[PDB]
Design a protein around this nucleic acid. Structure first.
Ligand SMILES: [Mg+2]
Ligand SMILES: [Mg+2]
Ligand SMILES: [Mg+2]
Ligand SMILES: [Mg+2]
Ligand SMILES: [Mg+2]
Ligand SMILES: [Mg+2]
Ligand SMILES: [Mg+2]
Ligand SMILES: [Mg+2]
Ligand SMILES: [Mg+2]
Ligand SMILES: [Mg+2]
Ligand SMILES: [Zn+2]
Ligand SMILES: [Zn+2]
Lengths: 25, 87, 217, 208, 81, 129, 96, 98, 125
RNA sequence: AGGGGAUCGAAGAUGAUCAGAUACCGUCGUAGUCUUAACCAUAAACUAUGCCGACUAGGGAUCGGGUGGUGUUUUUCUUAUGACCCACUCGGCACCUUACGAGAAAUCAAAGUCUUUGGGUUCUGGGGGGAGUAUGGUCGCAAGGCUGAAACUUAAAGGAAUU
């Protein structure tokens, strides 16, 4: 996997995580 | 070098380059000895008598060997105003 | 027996050069190994290692054997020879010859007070080959050689009795280390020390005194 | 020092001028050369001819000091000098090398062209560089016929000269030979201008 | 190269070298006695002006400023001090 | 900024020696530098040196015989405490027989041996061999 | 040159910088964070006594292949569960 | 490692050089990493000149040349044999062959 | 197809070097000579060698050839060499005295401290 | 959030190519591309070379300036500029050849003046993964940025060169 793609994936994951956190709040 | 009982140790004392005063090593396959013969009247060049100059390899490699040689010559008088001190 | 190419060899054969000292002084190139044999009768030959050394071909791989040989007595003379051949014995033999050809003098000295007969090196000397830097330091009497076994052997051969070492870099590649050590040893002459300040004669070379004995006519 | 007979006497100077030794320094100039005397307004530097003469004399003095005639090696790869070199060899003791040098000549004790000189004379460092390089490996001193352009690496005694030349190199060679002979005692007097010609050196292309 | 007398070099060489980079620093500029074609008065004009120097009695403009050395006004005649 | 002048001088000298020159042109020139040079001269590591007056800082022309194989300042002038000199000597000098550690004491600028003789110590300066 | 300060009054910087750097040295980090006590199944101790839960054969990594004969142990001191290899050819049938 | 000390570009003293598009495929390439071949082709092909001459009113006529500078992205150049792969030792030659 | 090997050509060269007098021109004689002198094992090889020698000889009678030495050629060369122009190129007689020099050259001559018949110009770019 | 919206064009449509092809190729095409007020603070933001200072080796170029040339041309007669030409000189973007120095080497006039180790300074790294992740701060409207672990895992990951 390209590093850039990995980074992108991570970012995507983090968005979801953020959303989850917001929901929890 | 010198032992306490006076007498010398030191297996051989090395030659120093007449231009730099820097020591010539044993595997200095670049260094040189120039022999310039003692001249006489009617030229004739006296047999088995000469002024010797050691040049280290380093100077030769650099290029300023010739100049050094010239300088050396014009202090033993082998050349007459070739090399000038003020450049 | 022996029949010499090169003027120096011829001279040696004749008996016009008594010791390798003269050769060392006049930086004359020793190109026949027999000269060394003639002049240094007491050379011990130490084989340091034999390692495989490989080359990829379309079919299999060509393996050759690298022989590393140190040569010397105990009176300030050492040679170092690296040789690669396919036969091991042959490689060793060639290496020995190479080492002999190389043979160098050493400036053996005192640590402090010149009581009697030099034991150490005269100066702190370093040698660098590859990455390996071998620092050799003048040690006090009866401290022995303080070195990695390879270097130690070389030191012993040279005839240094007491010496400290500080080998740095990738010392594990033994050949390089050995080379560095050799370089360091060589460096001992060529250091301008106050007990060498004063200018001397500049003798005519044995290649010039006996010019007539040189060349086969 | 030299006893007054070794001054640049007029005839020699004239000869040098004719050759055009003084002329061919070229516009481009190596920093290891103070053999210059002015720079002609066109661009071509002028060599100090007295200095050159002195250098030649010095070289001769060295050559004489070599005890065995054959131990001196004269080299030329460039055609404008081969003939001259040969002539020098014929006159002096001297071993010649003309044309191809063959590398591993001073090193490599197996070669048929294996020489052990104790002095090397070269027409040019620029073109016979290989020979010069080889000399370095075996402690052998190099007299070279440098113009004010050729590199001074491993050159011990340089004779400021012309290398565009044709005449000049040959003339220089002749002079070197003559001085050497005088030093030896092969020519009994210094005043007498020597029987043979400078033209006997030089170079001629196939013409018949 | 290798051996030189660094203390007293050749004059020409010194001249060639940059001011400051010489053995001892010294100006390359000089002062001038300027004669204006009209009146008999002598003014001491510095060779690298900057200002449009006039004669002390009459406004005539003796020198105009340039990059380095200032330019004299044609009718004027100078003599190096 | 020219933080150290002595250091610069020493470096220049070293450069000159390594390349085989027989003379250097030191450019800022001080008392300290002069003193250092004098020590070397006394010990015979240097020839005749002369101070050109610029009416500003100075300029030194130094003749080199060729014997000097390294100068070298040790820079942050460490306060050396008599028994500490030995350690310094062991570190900096290539042998136990020769070479000098130059140190500025209140008794003046001298080599370490001289200091020992006089029984004084101070701040270190440089070393020569 | 050289990245560090050298001046006779730098000292503090040399100290603090060194301290900062030290944290990249893993052993030091371990010592200072005290990961031998907080993590690690043995509480920074040379040995530990536990009670055998069961005997588990573990398949070795590559080049090799052999069932290794280990034991799942729960330590007395904290209650952490660990795998422990039983050395020598028999020996697994000494455990229970 | 560095394949080229020039980085294959030719800028150094600059900072940003404006890109030119490729003449073959429009691959946007910096104006220095550009491979600029200036083609002076004759407006009429070499074999068809005679016929044209024969046709033409006013004998002894100029017959013009068409001028354009072409910019090839390096890949394109490589493909189309404008540039060729050279040895490590002879990559260094900056002088054009002719 | 027909290109001669080392073992032919080198041998032929050697033969030529040794025996240029008495190894002359025509084939049969050359072959006979080869048979007499060289210890050639095969007949065909010998024949080939002879042919090569003949070829070399033929080439020779149109000028000298590289690698090929022989003691007569050297002598001839030497003879050729010993030629001198009676006037000489450095005689100055062609320039009708006063050798054409520049201003700088003249200055140099003066500074040396020498009297010479000189002719002075200028020359510019 | 306004204005502009010709071209080109993440998304989309949409025609082929393919086993698949919401990929390359083809045709359209909102956002964007331009701008005005804000924000954002990152790029292979690269010379992957921190800044200031000294010194060591030649060589031509070239740009900016300045000097000296009865040097060439310009011509409106001397001209006076200007443009050239030559020589020197500071400052710059580079380059060429040698390294006698460096370096693991590729290579480097610095990446030199380092086991012959110290001119002054700021920042950064300490096997590979886990991870630029978790967490806590803090700054952002948001995307994100700066800061930044550990458990556990692993005998290699890498660099330059070689056949
Ligand atoms: Mg690649
Ligand atoms: Mg800029
Ligand atoms: Mg950029
Ligand atoms: Mg789409
Ligand atoms: Mg489709
Ligand atoms: Mg498309
Ligand atoms: Mg970044
Ligand atoms: Mg970066
Ligand atoms: Mg890590
Ligand atoms: Mg790789
Ligand atoms: Zn007036
Ligand atoms: Zn393209």
């Amino acid at each position: 996997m390209r590093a850039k793609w990995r980074k992108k994936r991570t970012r995507r994951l983090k968005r979801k995580r953020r959303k989850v956190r917001a929901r929890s709040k | 070098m010198e032992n306490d009982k006076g007498q010398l140790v030191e297996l051989y004392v090395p030659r120093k380059c007449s231009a730099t005063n820097r020591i010539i090593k044993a595997k200095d396959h670049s260094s040189v000895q120039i022999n310039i013969a003692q001249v006489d009247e009617e030229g004739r060049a006296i047999p088995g008598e000469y002024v010797t100059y050691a040049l280290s390899g380093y100077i030769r490699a650099r290029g300023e060997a010739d100049d050094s040689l010239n300088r050396l010559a014009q202090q033993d008088g082998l050349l007459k105003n070739v090399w000038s001190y003020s450049r | 027996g022996w029949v010499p190419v090169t003027k120096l060899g011829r001279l040696v054969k004749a008996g016009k050069i008594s010791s390798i000292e003269e050769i060392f002084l006049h930086s004359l190139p020793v190109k026949e190994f027999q000269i060394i044999d003639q002049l240094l009768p007491n050379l011990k030959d130490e084989v340091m290692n034999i390692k495989p050394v490989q080359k990829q071909t379309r079919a299999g791989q060509r393996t050759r054997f690298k022989a590393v040989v140190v040569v010397g007595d105990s009176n300030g003379h050492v040679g170092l020879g690296i040789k690669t051949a396919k036969e091991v014995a042959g490689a060793i033999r060639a290496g020995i010859i190479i080492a002999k050809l190389s043979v160098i003098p050493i400036r053996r000295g005192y640590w402090g007070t010149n009581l009697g007969q030099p034991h150490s090196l005269a100066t702190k000397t370093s040698g660098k080959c590859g990455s390996v830097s071998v620092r050799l330091i003048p040690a006090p009497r009866g401290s022995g050689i303080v070195a990695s076994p390879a270097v130690k052997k070389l030191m012993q051969l040279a005839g240094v009795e007491d010496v400290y070492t500080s080998s740095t870099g990738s010392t594990r590649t033994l050949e390089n280390t050995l080379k560095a050590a050799f370089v360091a040893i060589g460096n001992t002459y060529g250091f301008l020390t106050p007990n060498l300040w004063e200018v001397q004669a500049l003798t005519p070379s044995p290649m010039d005194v006996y010019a007539d004995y040189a060349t086969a006519s | 020092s030299l006893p007054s007979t070794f001054d640049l006497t007029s005839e020699d100077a004239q000869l040098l001028l004719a050759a055009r030794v003084h002329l061919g320094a070229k516009n481009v100039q190596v920093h290891q050369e103070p053999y210059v005397y002015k720079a002609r307004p066109d661009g071509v530097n002028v060599i100090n001819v007295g200095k050159t003469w002195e250098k030649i004399v010095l070289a001769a003095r060295i050559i004489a000091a070599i005890p065995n005639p054959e131990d001196v090696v004269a080299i030329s790869s460039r055609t404008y000098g081969q003939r001259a070199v040969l002539k020098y060899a014929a006159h002096t003791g001297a071993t010649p090398i003309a044309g191809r040098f063959t590398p591993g000549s001073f090193t490599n004790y197996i070669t048929r062209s294996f020489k052990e000189p104790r002095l090397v004379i070269v027409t040019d460092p620029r073109s016979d560089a290989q020979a010069i390089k080889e000399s370095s490996y075996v402690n052998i001193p190099v007299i070279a016929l440098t113009d004010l352009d050729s590199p001074s690496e491993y050159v011990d005694v340089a004779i400021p000269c012309n290398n565009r030349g044709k005449h000049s190199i040959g003339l220089i060679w002749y002079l070197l030979a003559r001085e050497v002979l005088r030093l030896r005692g092969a020519l009994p007097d210094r005043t007498q201008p020597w029987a043979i010609m400078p033209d006997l050196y030089f170079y001629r292309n196939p013409e018949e | 190269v290798l051996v030189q007398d660094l203390l007293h070099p050749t004059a020409a060489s010194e001249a060639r070298k940059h001011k400051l980079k010489t053995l001892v620093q010294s100006p390359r500029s000089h002062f001038l006695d300027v004669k204006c074609p009209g009146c008999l008065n002598i003014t001491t004009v510095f060779s690298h002006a900057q200002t449009a120097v006039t004669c002390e009695s009459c406004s005539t403009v003796l020198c105009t400023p340039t990059g380095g050395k200032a330019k004299l006004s044609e009718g004027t005649s100078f003599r190096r001090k | 900024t020219r933080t150290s002048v002595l250091a610069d001088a020493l470096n220049a000298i070293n450069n000159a020696e390594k390349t085989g020159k027989r003379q250097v042109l030191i450019r800022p020139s001080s008392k300290v530098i002069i003193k250092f040079l004098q020590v070397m001269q006394k010990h015979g590591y240097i020839g005749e040196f002369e101070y050109i007056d610029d009416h500003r800082s100075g300029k030194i022309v130094v003749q080199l015989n060729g014997r000097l194989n390294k100068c070298g300042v040790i820079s942050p002038r460490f306060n050396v405490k008599i028994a500490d000199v030995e350690k310094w000597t062991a570190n900096l000098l290539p042998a136990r027989q020769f070479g000098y550690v130059i140190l500025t004491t209140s008794a003046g600028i001298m080599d370490h041996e001289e200091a020992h003789r006089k029984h004084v110590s101070g701040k270190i300066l440089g070393f020569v061999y | 040159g050289k990245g560090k300060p050298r001046g006779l009054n730098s000292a503090r910087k040399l100290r603090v910088h060194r301290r900062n750097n030290r944290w990249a040295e893993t052993t030091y980090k371990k010592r200072l964070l005290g990961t031998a006590f907080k993590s690690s199944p043995f509480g920074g101790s040379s040995h530990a006594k536990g009670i055998v839960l069961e005997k588990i054969g573990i398949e070795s990594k590559q080049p090799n292949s052999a069932i290794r004969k280990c034991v799942r142990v729960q330590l007395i001191k904290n209650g952490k569960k660990v795998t422990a290899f039983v050395p020598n050819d028999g020996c697994l049938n000494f455990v229970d | 490692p560095k394949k080229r000390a020039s980085n294959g570009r030719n800028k150094k003293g600059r900072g940003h050089v404006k890109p030119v598009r490729c003449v073959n495929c429009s691959r946007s390439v910096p104006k220095d990493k550009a491979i600029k071949r200036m083609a002076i082709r004759n407006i009429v092909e070499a074999a068809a000149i005679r016929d044209l001459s024969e046709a033409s009113v006013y004998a002894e006529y100029a017959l013009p040349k068409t001028y354009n500078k072409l910019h090839y992205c390096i890949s394109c150049a490589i493909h189309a044999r404008i540039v060729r792969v050279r040895s490590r030792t002879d990559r260094r030659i900056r002088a054009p062959p002719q | 197809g027909r290109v001669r090997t080392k073992t032919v050509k080198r041998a032929s060269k050697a033969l030529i070097e040794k025996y240029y007098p008495k190894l002359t021109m025509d084939f049969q004689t050359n072959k006979r000579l080869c048979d007499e002198i060289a210890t050639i094992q095969s007949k065909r090889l010998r024949n080939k060698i002879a042919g090569y020698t003949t070829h070399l000889m033929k080439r020779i009678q149109k000028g000298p050839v590289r690698g090929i030495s022989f003691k007569l050629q050297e002598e001839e060369r030497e003879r050729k060499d010993q030629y001198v122009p009676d006037v000489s190129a450095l005689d100055l007689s062609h320039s009708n005295d006063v050798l054409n020099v520049d201003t700088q050259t003249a200055e140099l001559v003066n500074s040396l401290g020498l009297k010479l018949p000189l002719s002075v110009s200028s020359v510019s770019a």
